[PDB]
Amino acid sequence: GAMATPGSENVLPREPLIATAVKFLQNSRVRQSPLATRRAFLKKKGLTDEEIDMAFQQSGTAADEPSSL
């Protein structure tokens, strides 16, 4: 897929949502809450554990897949 994620018809807005979750996880106030609380908050927002794991993975400064979110 890379740039073109096969969604319902167009690209799936999964990446922009994960990007939003990364901003959330990098927030000072948010970082003060227990890990379980941060994950659960993202789950209630509609993200899956797979997407949350990806958000945590990109919340530092890394990119295992050469594309850069």
Partner: peptide, 15 residues
């Protein structure tokens, strides 16, 4: 909708 309501709900509730 913006994420502000959520973030604020988040740390205010888990404060």
């Amino acid at each position: 909708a913006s994420e502000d309501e959520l973030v604020a709900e988040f740390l205010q509730d888990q404060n």
